[PDB]
Design a protein around this ligand. Structure first.
Ligand SMILES: Nc1nc2c(ncn2[C@@H]2O[C@H](COP(=O)(O)OP(=O)(O)OP(=O)(O)O)[C@@H](O)[C@H]2O)c(=O)[nH]1
Ligand SMILES: Nc1nc2c(ncn2[C@@H]2O[C@H](COP(=O)(O)OP(=O)(O)OP(=O)(O)O)[C@@H](O)[C@H]2O)c(=O)[nH]1
Lengths: 328, 311, 441, 453
């Protein structure tokens, strides 16, 4: 964990956080960050074990909700979800850069290379398929990011900065599950009293604001994982986050077989550097088998994505309709 | 509380007073949804219509609390069914309604009886406006589709089939629109004007509510509406027959364009069908004419009489 | 629901200027397009959406595209309305000033630059979703105007078969240029029989006479007649620009006024109005609406055969005088025995954001009639055309493009226009007979 | 994944657009023409990041990480005198070789080959002044022969000198050429290396530049400097995703991931709304447009900076970055409308991508009509049309071999036969590139991996 905090300080120096590190008003906040390592058992990788927590102290701990040992670990599960997403995205980026560099090397030292044409075609198409996979991944990731950041900004503008530029909506309504809309409490007059500072929140009010914010985060349908209140996708029998985790596992297997294919291609490249098309026939056969495997994985994932689109369209939510249309 | 703005809002909502645009837009946006919810059962999902309604309410200005608190609901009974429930009359369409949860202290003046009256009047106006919208859509399909305006092949059909149904649609328009203008001017307009002129320097809020309920009663106790309801229940079925006939003829027009005598036999079937339909409409019109001539109370009545007098 | 205005020719540009000024004064928009209403109250009962596009600046740009072969009149209209119209909604064909008063040159200009106008109208329609139809402002007498109108009518009928298209066309007065002007008219009239879904007729001679009657100076300027047409167009659109309960669509008005697509030519009337006391009751208003000296077209008929009549009375009116005038009019107006004796009245609300017109509290009324008087002016025009055609072959000298390559096709097109207007007037005069609907009775 | 990028100014156009881009960046980051940040160095909190493009020696000074390379010392001296202390004099390369002996690509390639040691030393020294580096942004100015040759030389050096760095390029093509043969030959020779080594290339056809400068500016006469201002503003808007990093795209490699479907298709088509930081930018508040209208204009051919030639064009990677106060519902509506109005290849279900940027806290805030702008980049095959006519020129002049006595000097081959063979090879390369682009316009392209496995 000393190399860990060293890398943390270095990344802070590279990022704009160094500015906050320079300002003493922000050094206290930047020092309150304390990464944590969760005991997930022996044999796992750093991409699955490393967590990023923040340690708060009074008088701050009495307002902001942290991943307390007796809490619900909202930030913990959210960071784990975003961490798996970022891990998939980084793996896609690594495969992309490896493929791009190796194809650039081919183009540099191909000369004529007549027998490579078909292989180059296959590699281009497979990189396009990987690009489509990464596009779907980053698409779901960006949709999640958009919804999350929308929640954040609406919270700031309506909960953290409510007393500044209020909504002016003096009407407090309550929606019932049977479509009934009832006015909450007594109706106040339009500020007219016979006549002839800031409505700010205290400790517990701000803490309840934070907790309701976390709840609105976790109460999202796509975040409603393994709950009886969520509806499962039609013709699938599985909840939407369940099918999402299944698709994440599928695309991770796709990334791994793509890494294997890239290793095979690098070995074939080294062989071409060694001799001029006199060997690597077994490597060509293994390349063909990996191509067939990748095609099968792509077909299965496309069927799963079509089922997911059908579920989003038939769920009733217009936002799911829009997401399935955009994926379509 | 500015009671004048609230009463203006409720007149716009439940009475359509100076708000025909909003309700017309809502009807045009979801004609298909209404017909698919009225032809199906209660088990059919209407959540799409509810989502459209809440979206329209969100696009509504937040100051209009009467429209911001507007809530939609589906009933298990039809409008003539609840009319038979509340009034001694004899009647799966028009199961929709809208309601408002009047808060304190506004609930002590805006009671639930006036709310039920508003719901009844709103469902009635919705029926009327949907029928007028169906007539407008029929006229649009007739005057815009090229097959309807197209003629040829020694027609014998345009003058007999097209001209006849056009005259029939004209008759239905001269009936529905006439009675709508009559009810909205001699009843709706006069009651709106009285409601406007009464709150000028008021004395008792209970007196205001009593005047409001008395106007609602005069709207309900109108002999024209009571005489129309049973005849309306048949005129609307005649309108449904007319529009399904229009759809069938529109589907047949593209096929009749040029060789087979079976097509002529189908044309004979259609001409006897529409002649029988016109005769049935004429008989229902004569029945309603007898019913209104037996009524006693007459300007708009004389106008409707002139409309129903055969040329 | 949204409607787009089409100003063809200098006449169209003038009447569009006048109408948009009138509507900006009514809806409190002014000559700068900015909302003349305060931002404290958003409650409104009018509808500026179908005629004005409101941007983030809350400026109302008129939903109108100006098409003409004369850039000077359009530039002048822009100068008098600096900051009101959109420069992108301006179309002058980039061909310079006008040249040739024949329908051939105008239609050829329309065919050559049809792509730009199509792109403009597609961009205007894509700005919104709920569109209903277009409004065409042109004079049948003007050659370039009539050619552009016929070209755009063809484009909108073979491009938008679902959008009802209505037009405003003013027939020229008894003058000298008709010998060629009528030509354009009948050609346009040809398309008016084929693609025009609706048309409001006007006769320039009767318009000039009625203006000289209402105006003190008999030297009637064309801008005064343009003001009259702007007033009548704002009046017929009052039910659309100010809908309350009954009429909220021009489709309904053409339903209650146009019984069949073959008969879509209506004659207007409007009385009383200024362009300061009240002396015309609603009963008097309607009996004047019946009077020929209040119609915007030369009647030239003793007892015209009214088919379907519909009127809108503007002002605060009691239904008693309404019913009295309705009974008197039914006693006065004759209907065919095969058609209905339908008479409908719309109570048009006054705009509280409009400056008070002279003769305040004076109730007014507009009426649209379908009778055999429109066919009388049509017969006058067709007779003038037939005389000047069968008597002199001079039209073979002023043609452009496909019409200039051969004049025999021009003669054939003119003969076909004569034939179709003859069939139209025959259908009209047959509708006057009870035996018109004899095929069902 | 974010690294520093160094700007490469090659040719007179390259140096002019570099000057304009650095002035625009100084305007955005309040650095001015003196190299000293116009903001006091006491405010440490900065939402932007000048480090990827500005080296900070003193706290108030930010030296632009760029090298000035040209054969004409007059323009370099002019830019240095206008930007007193802004640029680094040690990063200004002229080689003292005098004026260019013609507009031949061979001349520039030779002057880059002979002085390759000095420029490589300067590049290595600049790399030593940084730690986290990602790649370069090269300005070709392929309209000039010496500039195109110098750009090709730098590309041929940096492809094998730094294979682990992503090399993006910016080629500016002219509308009309006084001697189309020479400029066509220079552009073909540069495009050969672009296909071989360049990782990303943005084309800039001067026809649309002249058209836009005549449309939005009041003056009918078009000056080259405010025309280069357009390209500089474009480059600043595209680099905004790193200078003002958003929450979706934070690295040039990530930006090119969604823009480069394959190393073969590495030529993009740009588009931008009416700018706001240009000279005559007062006629922008009268537009009264929304974000949906901004997207429409980005998809409109009138706002494309290259020759559109839109005859049912096939798109491959449509992306956009929107700067300003952007609304998500307008974005969703615009995406819905564009997916109904954009031709996509049926073999790929990938649609267009939308990105939203942030406005600088020190840039002049515009009225609510043009307060939000946007840039669009679409992978289209129509770019080869810009070369097609050029190849046509080749195809109609290479039968004789005019101007051959000018491409024989400087390069490694003085004979006519070797130069002819090299030109034929470059023509074959660009022909194969056009064939790849026209094959990508078909579904059989992706079906090639389906027919065999
Ligand atoms: N009432 C009225 N009619 C006009 C006005 N301007 C033109 N007109 C009509 O237009 C006819 C004359 O033709 P022009 O307006 O010159 O149309 P044109 O022949 O195509 O010539 P250009 O409009 O210049 O292209 C007259 O008979 C009028 O009926 C006007 O301002 N008021
Ligand atoms: N639009 C535009 N194009 C330019 C500009 N400067 C140069 N060019 C292009 O460059 C071509 C002329 O070549 P130069 O850029 O001067 O290159 P060169 O001839 O080798 O001269 P040096 O670069 O000074 O060595 C012209 O055809 C232009 O298309 C400019 O400022 N604006």
């Amino acid at each position: 964990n000393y190399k860990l905090t060293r890398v943390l300080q270095e990344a802070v120096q590279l990022s704009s956080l160094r500015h906050l590190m320079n300002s003493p008003r922000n050094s206290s906040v930047i020092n309150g960050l304390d990464a944590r390592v969760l005991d997930l058992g022996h044999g796992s990788v750093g991409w699955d074990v490393f967590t990023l927590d923040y340690i708060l102290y009074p008088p701050l701990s009495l307002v902001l909700n942290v991943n307390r040992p007796f809490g619900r670990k909202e930030y913990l599960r959210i960071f784990n979800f975003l961490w798996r997403f970022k891990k998939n995205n980084y793996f896609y980026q690594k495969e992309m850069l490896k493929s791009n560099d190796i194809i650039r090397s081919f183009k540099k030292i191909r000369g004529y290379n007549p027998l490579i044409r078909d292989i180059i075609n296959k590699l281009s198409r497979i990189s396009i398929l990987r690009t489509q996979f990464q596009q779907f991944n980053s698409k779901m990731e960006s949709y999640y990011l958009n919804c999350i950041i929308e929640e954040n900004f609406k919270e700031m503008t309506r909960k953290l900065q409510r007393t500044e530029n209020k909504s002016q909506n003096q009407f407090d309504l309550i929606r019932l599950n049977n479509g009934t809309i009832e006015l909450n409490g007594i109706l106040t007059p339009k500020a007219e009293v016979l006549t002839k500072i800031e409505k700010t929140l205290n400790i517990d009010e701000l803490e309840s604001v934070h907790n309701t914010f976390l709840t609105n985060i976790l109460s999202h349908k796509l975040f409603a994982t393994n709950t009886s209140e969520i509806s499962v996708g039609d013709y699938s029998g599985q909840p939407y986050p369940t099918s999402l985790v299944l698709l994440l596992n599928s695309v991770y297997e796709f990334v791994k077989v793509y890494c294997n294919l890239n290793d095979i291609g690098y070995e074939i490249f080294i062989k071409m550097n060694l001799n001029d098309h006199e060997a690597s026939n077994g490597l060509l056969g293994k390349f063909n088998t990996n191509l067939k495997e990748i095609v099968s994985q792509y077909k299965n994932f496309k069927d799963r994505l079509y089922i997911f689109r059908a579920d989003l369209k038939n769920d009733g939510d217009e936002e799911l309709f829009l997401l399935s249309k955009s994926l379509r | 509380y500015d009671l004048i703005n609230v009463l203006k809002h409720l007149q716009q909502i439940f009475l359509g007073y100076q708000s025909g645009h909003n309700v017309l837009k809502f009807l045009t946006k979801n004609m298909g949804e209404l017909t698919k919810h009225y032809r199906n059962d209660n088990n059919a999902n209407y959540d799409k219509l509810l989502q459209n309604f809440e979206l329209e309410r969100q696009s509504e200005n937040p100051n209009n609390l009467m429209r911001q608190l507007l809530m939609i609901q589906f009933d298990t009974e039809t409008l003539p069914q609840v009319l038979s429930h509340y009034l001694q009359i004899y009647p799966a369409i028009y199961h929709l309604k809208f309601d408002i949860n009047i808060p304190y202290p506004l609930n002590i003046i805006i009671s639930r009886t006036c709310m039920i009256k508003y719901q009844i009047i709103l469902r009635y106006q919705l029926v009327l406006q949907y029928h007028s919208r169906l007539l407008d859509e029929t006229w649009m399909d007739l005057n815009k589709t090229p097959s309807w305006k197209y003629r040829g092949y020694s027609h014998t059909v345009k003058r007999r089939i097209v001209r006849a149904t056009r005259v029939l649609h004209a008759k239905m328009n001269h009936f529905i629109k006439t009675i709508m203008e009559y009810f909205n001017q001699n009843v709706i307009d006069k009651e709106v004007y009285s409601l406007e002129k009464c709150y000028r320097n008021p004395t008792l809020a209970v007196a205001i509510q009593n005047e409001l309920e008395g106007g609602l009663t005069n709207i309900m106790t109108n002999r024209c509406l009571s005489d129309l309801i049973p005849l309306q229940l048949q005129i609307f079925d005649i309108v449904y027959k007319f529009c399904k006939f229009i759809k069938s003829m529109r589907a047949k027009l593209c096929q009749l364009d040029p060789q087979e005598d079976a097509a002529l036999e189908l044309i004979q079937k259609l001409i006897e069908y529409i002649s029988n339909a016109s005769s049935i409409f004429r008989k229902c019109l004569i029945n309603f004419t007898q019913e209104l001539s037996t009524e006693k109370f007459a300007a708009g009545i004389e106008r409707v009489l002139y409309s129903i007098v055969p040329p | 629901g949204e409607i787009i205005t089409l100003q063809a020719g200098q006449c169209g540009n003038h009447v569009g200027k006048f109408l948009w000024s009138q509507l900006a004064k009514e809806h409190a928009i002014g000559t700068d397009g900015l909302s003349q209403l305060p931002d404290s109250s958003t409650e409104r009962d009018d509808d500026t959406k179908p005629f004005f596009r409101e941007n983030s600046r809350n400026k109302f740009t008129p939903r109108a595209i100006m098409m003409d072969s004369e850039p000077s009149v359009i530039a002048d209209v822009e100068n008098t309305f600096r900051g009101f119209f959109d420069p992108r909604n301006t179309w002058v064909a980039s061909d310079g000033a006008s040249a040739g008063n024949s329908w051939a040159n105008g239609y050829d200009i329309g065919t050559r630059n049809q792509d730009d106008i199509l792109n403009k109208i597609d961009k205007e329609i894509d700005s919104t979703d709920n569109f209903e139809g277009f409004q065409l402002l042109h004079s049948v007498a003007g050659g370039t105007g009539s050619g552009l109108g016929s070209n755009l009518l063809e484009a909108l009928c073979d491009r938008y078969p679902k959008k009802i298209l209505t037009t405003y066309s003013v027939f020229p007065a008894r003058s000298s240029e008709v010998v060629v002007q009528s030509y354009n008219t009948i050609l346009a009239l040809r398309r008016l029989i084929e693609d025009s879904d609706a048309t409001v007729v006007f006769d320039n001679a009767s318009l000039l006479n009625i203006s000289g009657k209402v105006f003190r100076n008999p030297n009637i300027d064309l801008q005064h007649t343009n003001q009259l047409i702007s007033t009548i167009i704002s009046s017929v659109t009052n039910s659309i620009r100010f809908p309350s309960y009954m009429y909220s669509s021009m489709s309904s008005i053409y339903s209650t006024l146009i019984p069949s697509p073959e008969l879509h030519f209506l004659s207007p009337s409007f009385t009383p109005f200024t362009s300061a006391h009240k002396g015309h009751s609603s009963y008097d208003v309607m009996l004047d609406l019946l009077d020929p000296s209040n119609s915007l077209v030369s009647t030239a008929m003793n007892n015209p055969t009214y088919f379907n009549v519909y009127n809108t009375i503007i002002g605060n009116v009691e239904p008693r005088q309404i019913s009295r005038a309705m009974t008197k009019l039914q006693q006065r107006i004759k209907f065919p025995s095969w058609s209905s004796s339908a008479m409908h009245v719309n109570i048009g609300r006054r705009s509280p954001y409009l400056p008070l017109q002279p003769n305040e509290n004076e109730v007014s009324g507009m009426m649209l009639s379908n009778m055999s008087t429109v066919v009388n002016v049509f017969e006058n025009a067709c007779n003038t055309f037939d005389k000047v055609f069968a008597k002199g072959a001079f039209l073979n000298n002023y043609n452009v493009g496909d019409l200039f390559q051969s004049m025999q096709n021009v003669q054939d097109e003119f003969a076909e226009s004569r034939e179709v207007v003859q069939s139209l007037m025959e259908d009209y005069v047959a509708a006057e007979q009870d035996s018109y609907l004899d095929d069902v009775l």
